[PDB]
Motif scaffolding. Structure first.
Motif, PDB file in Angstrom:
ATOM      1  N   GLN A 234       9.981  67.886 -56.966  1.00 14.81           N
ATOM      2  CA  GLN A 234       8.549  68.108 -56.817  1.00 14.81           C
ATOM      3  C   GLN A 234       8.315  69.234 -55.823  1.00 14.81           C
ATOM      4  N   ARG A 235       7.522  70.221 -56.226  1.00  9.89           N
ATOM      5  CA  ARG A 235       7.138  71.326 -55.359  1.00  9.89           C
ATOM      6  C   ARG A 235       5.663  71.198 -55.010  1.00  9.89           C
ATOM      7  N   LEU A 236       5.381  71.076 -53.716  1.00 13.94           N
ATOM      8  CA  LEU A 236       4.046  70.807 -53.211  1.00 13.94           C
ATOM      9  C   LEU A 236       3.548  72.011 -52.431  1.00 13.94           C
ATOM     10  N   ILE A 237       2.302  72.394 -52.701  1.00 17.34           N
ATOM     11  CA  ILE A 237       1.642  73.512 -52.045  1.00 17.34           C
ATOM     12  C   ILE A 237       0.318  73.004 -51.499  1.00 17.34           C
ATOM     13  N   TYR A 238       0.181  73.011 -50.176  1.00 16.43           N
ATOM     14  CA  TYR A 238      -1.018  72.525 -49.516  1.00 16.43           C
ATOM     15  C   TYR A 238      -1.875  73.690 -49.027  1.00 16.43           C
ATOM     16  N   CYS A 321       2.961  73.999 -45.485  1.00 13.02           N
ATOM     17  CA  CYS A 321       2.194  74.225 -46.706  1.00 13.02           C
ATOM     18  C   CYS A 321       3.059  74.144 -47.960  1.00 13.02           C
ATOM     19  N   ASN A 322       4.332  74.534 -47.873  1.00 14.81           N
ATOM     20  CA  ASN A 322       5.282  74.462 -48.983  1.00 14.81           C
ATOM     21  C   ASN A 322       6.326  73.394 -48.683  1.00 14.81           C
ATOM     22  N   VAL A 323       6.331  72.326 -49.477  1.00 14.78           N
ATOM     23  CA  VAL A 323       7.229  71.202 -49.248  1.00 14.78           C
ATOM     24  C   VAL A 323       7.916  70.855 -50.560  1.00 14.78           C
TER      25      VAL A 323
HETATM   26  C1  LIG Z   1       5.377  78.512 -51.775  1.00 18.42           C
HETATM   27  O1  LIG Z   1       5.915  78.070 -53.031  1.00 18.42           O
HETATM   28  C2  LIG Z   1       5.353  78.734 -54.173  1.00 18.42           C
HETATM   29  C3  LIG Z   1       5.964  78.087 -55.394  1.00 18.42           C
HETATM   30  O2  LIG Z   1       5.739  76.683 -55.406  1.00 18.42           O
HETATM   31  C4  LIG Z   1       5.629  80.233 -54.090  1.00 18.42           C
HETATM   32  O3  LIG Z   1       4.999  80.887 -55.186  1.00 18.42           O
HETATM   33  C5  LIG Z   1       5.109  80.799 -52.775  1.00 18.42           C
HETATM   34  O4  LIG Z   1       5.499  82.161 -52.651  1.00 18.42           O
HETATM   35  C6  LIG Z   1       5.659  80.002 -51.592  1.00 18.42           C
HETATM   36  N1  LIG Z   1       5.118  80.498 -50.332  1.00 18.42           N
HETATM   37  C7  LIG Z   1       3.827  80.428 -49.980  1.00 18.42           C
HETATM   38  C8  LIG Z   1       3.485  80.999 -48.638  1.00 18.42           C
HETATM   39  O5  LIG Z   1       2.971  79.931 -50.709  1.00 18.42           O
END
Ligand SMILES: *[C@@H]1O[C@H](CO)[C@@H](O)[C@H](O)[C@H]1NC(C)=O
Ligand SMILES: *[C@@H]1O[C@H](CO)[C@@H](O[C@@H]2O[C@H](CO)[C@@H](O)[C@H](O)[C@H]2NC(C)=O)[C@H](O)[C@H]1NC(C)=O
Ligand SMILES: *[C@@H]1O[C@H](CO)[C@@H](O)[C@H](O)[C@H]1NC(C)=O
Ligand SMILES: *[C@@H]1O[C@H](CO)[C@@H](O)[C@H](O)[C@H]1NC(C)=O
Ligand SMILES: *[C@@H]1O[C@H](CO)[C@@H](O)[C@H](O)[C@H]1NC(C)=O
Ligand SMILES: [Ba+2]
Ligand SMILES: [Cl-]
Ligand SMILES: [Cl-]
Ligand SMILES: [Cl-]
Lengths: 414, 418, 417
Positions: A234-238, A321-323
């Motif tokens: 699971q890729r989470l973006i907050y 923010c990225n988990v």
């Molecule tokens: C966070 O993850 C996404 C993919 O899930 C990626 O596109 C992004 O570049 C990453 N970094 C940030 C700061 O959102």
């Protein structure tokens, strides 16, 4: 009469424009977000890091007289008066050994004790297979946790490349056959804080970017079973403030390269113990001095417990923010089969009972070659607000920003 | 020629305004919503209510001759003719005991009540509970409240009813939760000598983790826990907020039932069942609440059970239970380790005066906790509000023809004058 | 001076209108969606299809001399030289049987078929199924339909194929679902006397809960069930609706497969594999569907397995399976209780004429049911449609300069002069 209804219509229409416009204004200032779920197919998935500990902190055969003297009270084998516990339900050999090691007539580092006395992966690891190919105990990296000497497969630390899997299913993952060595467990003759009745292992599946926190985030695996663990990446973006609550600036701690909520927690704990007791426990990282068993009793433990209870606000760790999280479903089958018990018992020079009470097989894999994405997405952007205010402004009175400026001119002249 | 191109442009623009506007209008009357997921950290979490039952409804040693007389057929210990069924695989002592209790010669039937029978013949928590720990400190059996379910006499920890304040946990992980060592007392299980529909081969307990605001429904929402293992349950608190009609389907009104203070779907189901059985059979089952008279085993046989099965089968329209808008659910992940270790088997056997065989086949440890100090929120959010609708209609109405509501009012002005 | 300040206001207004308008345009051309989660109560639920396999591929007592001759090396019963491996830790009788079956002296072989061998040697549902119940009423072994998978002869309850109607459940909870007592027949397992790649130590069954619209994929999508426990499986029906391009990636077309009537990602996977094996080796394995000739154990050894392994890595771009737009998934939570109880162990032993040891290591009860009579829906919903785009562009276009499409048309008209 026509001009009167026209004026009242303009007044009421401007009122409606007022309440609708302020409605969208306030709604925009709530900074709302909504959730986007998606499923992404991939040709490859990076295999996670797998940390496991034996539920038994240290081996009984590796403890020595000096270890009993210094850390005898902490290890709960000896009492405050350096005497053996109640002799109820004591193995004759074990009790004779302990009394001999506790002679204390004409007779230390915590990490030396855990590193040497802990369960060796070279003896526990009966077989290893990754994607159908053999692995060595050298692939596991030693990590020290609250449970003692623990091991992490595919840790990816010190520059080692992270492993990938190009197929899903039970075969195409990590698969280890372990011997938990239940004969090496500490004998329990009397009630103690460390006293435990469980036998088995504890596992945590986690991304390489975060350190293990196995006492809190681990699940159990019992001997006598092959447990399958199906994982779903699971890729989470907050969203950061003012939308949500995330750490926009990584602000990585000196201890760990990548910031994680777990790493922040154990960092706060290490800092607190260094401030209050001028020493660090076995599991904590850094270059600080490790605590002595006397320091453990009179300072370390009450400081940690008091840190949890007294000031919960003091350690506030924001979520990144990225988990990358790993979901998992467990199931079991019986090991060994009646057709295989004899071959295992003879292969590893053990009794069939011993195999029954000591062998577990762990099978960690990805269910399918895909990963889910859960993204918090902004619900009202400034373009949408200006568009809505413009639409309602043009529908109710048909005015514009230039119209209000011209009204300020005509009001100014007259 | 220019007036023709103007007429075509105005006509096409007015048509596009028509279909686009009707598009946004129809979308509004769908009353659409979309979902907002969030994760909220907290310094404290209210620990849930934990209900557990023994898979064995009542103890064999506590059953009496009167119980065999009144409820012998229902308890499946005696046949229709008040005679013991096939004796296959019957221990001589157990069969002699039962045969003695079923003599029924010059026997005066004492008064019998189903709740008395379950209350005394059921498994006593004072005997099952070998140890209790919450947040590392001792708990008493007084924290457990007696609840009657379909499984019999069951217990609810941290029920928060009868004025007791609900417990909280300020730390997550395996240690900082509920942890009970139970003895399921397999020696007290009803002997199974002949095949029957009620015959079951399982041994262990059944647990349901639920909010204090809802009653347990252990026959449907529970999970099993087997002896011989320490079972870990990692919980994740979830707070759900739904939308009422016409957006979604939720119970907006409090809808307090006579039986339960707070509305819950479970309370709505068991309330519906209670009302149906009270009207149809003039008696109430053991698990149901209220002040109605409890059924007699004859009423159980000839009325109650077929009435409930007929209610389930004939039509769901009689019991339609909507979900409340505010719902607290608890997610859970199970894992197991073996108990006891070889280093502890003798100590346990001597501590509780049992054989190591008995300990091996009767002791289970339950460890219920929150994985971390956070909770998820799942909220249904309205996707199209009247302000946004008017904004879009005004924007497109101003884009295509540049008119306003005042402009259409003026055209109606000329129409009235005409 | 007034015309200058007006000119500054009109210029700034036109620039802001430019950047805001291009903002909404680009946001529309990202084709974004957001998710709608809902939970729906229902009076009835269609029960899923349940496929289970024994972990043991074929019974040792049903293997014959001809089977040893043709497929002895493939089944790992015989070595490369068609000789039995080391007899270490082999029961005298157990090895005597195999040594007699592998004699190959004055033996005149007979024809051999892999699917006949699995169909005859696999574990029979008539022997494994000790008891079956669906919604409290008894079921027969005839209710289970035979499917051949990588694990061998497997069975699917409520398969809904061959014109059978799919079953429904009108109540939730442990009682009101499929509930089977199985004997995994651990005595029939292949003897493990020497280390080999194919050697496995597990005993039990493997289950996959899936929609009737998809074929099973138990080697990848199954979970295990161990003997000696009653395993409860609580299912949650989930209804998923995805978006086609350009919003998401779903199958817009029906996507007719030759092998299967209905499209599913699993059907696409086994379709890719079957086609690849037919093109490279001109034969199909037992689990594969179609009308091709089944492979011979020699064909299995020298072509099939290395071809599949080469398919996994080399042609990882070659097999791309898109996900269908409407998908019914079943979520599951597993829990266990001990079987049998001391009060029932001997009754089971006498009922099935077995020792209590055997019952302890061979009996499992599987209880599959719906936790409650409801289903969740997860829908991808378009976040910005053209009507919203035109509304926002008109609103900002009317706010900043008060213009319209007719205004710009008139500006092009005056420019035309
Ligand atoms: C966070 O993850 C996404 C993919 O899930 C990626 O596109 C992004 O570049 C990453 N970094 C940030 C700061 O959102
Ligand atoms: C459902 O929960 C929400 C909060 O999650 C409740 O909303 C609160 O209502 C109280 C009034 O009693 C207000 O003081 C709070 O400010 C509200 N909070 C928010 C965030 O709006 C709501 O009342 C609950 N509904 C029911 C029926 O209990
Ligand atoms: C096998 O086990 C026995 C029993 O402890 C031991 O004496 C012997 O040394 C073991 N063999 C080997 C090769 O270690
Ligand atoms: C243990 O239980 C048995 C069972 O009746 C009893 O006879 C014995 O006295 C008990 N022992 C102790 C020490 O209480
Ligand atoms: C029960 O099994 C035994 C062998 O274990 C056999 O001799 C006997 O005939 C069987 N009885 C029945 C009734 O099948
Ligand atoms: Ba080739
Ligand atoms: Cl919001
Ligand atoms: Cl909708
Ligand atoms: Cl997007």
């Amino acid at each position: 009469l026509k001009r009167v209804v026209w004026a009242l219509c303009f007044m009421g229409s401007l009122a409606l424009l007022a309440l609708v416009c302020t409605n969208r204004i306030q709604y925009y200032f709530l900074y709302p977000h909504v959730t986007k779920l998606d499923e992404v197919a991939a040709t490859r998935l990076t295999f996670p890091a797998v940390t496991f500990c034996n539920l038994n902190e240290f081996r009984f055969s590796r403890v020595t007289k000096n270890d009993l003297y210094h850390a005898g009270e902490l290890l709960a084998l000896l009492n405050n008066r350096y005497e053996i516990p109640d002799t109820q339900t004591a193995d004759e050999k074990q009790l004779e050994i302990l009394q001999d090691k506790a002679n204390f007539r004409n007779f230390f580092n915590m990490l030396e004790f855990y590193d040497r006395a802990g369960h060796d992966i070279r003896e526990m690891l009966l077989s290893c297979f990754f994607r159908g190919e053999q692995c060595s105990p050298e692939d596991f990296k030693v990590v020290f946790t609250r449970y003692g000497k623990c091991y992490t497969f595919n840790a990816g630390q010190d520059g080692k490349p992270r492993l990938i899997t190009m197929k899903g299913g039970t075969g195409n993952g990590l698969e280890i056959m372990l011997d938990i060595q239940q004969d090496e467990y500490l004998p329990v003759w009397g009630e103690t804080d460390e006293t435990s009745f469980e036998a088995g292992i504890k596992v945590q599946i986690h991304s390489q970017d975060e350190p293990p926190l196995i006492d809190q985030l681990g699940f159990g695996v019992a001997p006598g079973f092959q447990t399958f663990v199906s994982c779903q990446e699971q890729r989470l973006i907050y969203l950061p403030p003012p939308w949500g609550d995330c750490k926009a600036t990584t602000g990585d701690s000196e201890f760990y390269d990548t910031y994680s909520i777990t790493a922040c927690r154990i960092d706060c704990e290490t800092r607190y113990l260094v401030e209050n007791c001028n020493c660090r426990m076995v599991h904590m990282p850094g270059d600080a001095p490790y605590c002595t068993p006397e320091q453990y009793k009179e300072c370390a433990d009450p400081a940690l417990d008091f840190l949890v209870e007294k000031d919960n606000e003091y350690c506030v760790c924001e979520m990144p923010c990225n988990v990358t999280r790993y979901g998992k479903e467990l199931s079991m089958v019986k090991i060994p089969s009646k057709a295989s018990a004899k071959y295992l018992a003879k292969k590893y020079n053990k009794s069939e009972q011993y195999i029954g009470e000591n062998i577990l097989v762990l099978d960690i894999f990805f269910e399918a070659l895909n990963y889910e994405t859960i993204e918090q997405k902004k619900a009202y952007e400034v373009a949408g607000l200006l568009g809505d205010i413009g639409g309602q402004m043009g529908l109710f009175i048909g005015a514009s920003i230039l119209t209000v400026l011209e009204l300020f001119d005509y009001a100014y002249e007259v």
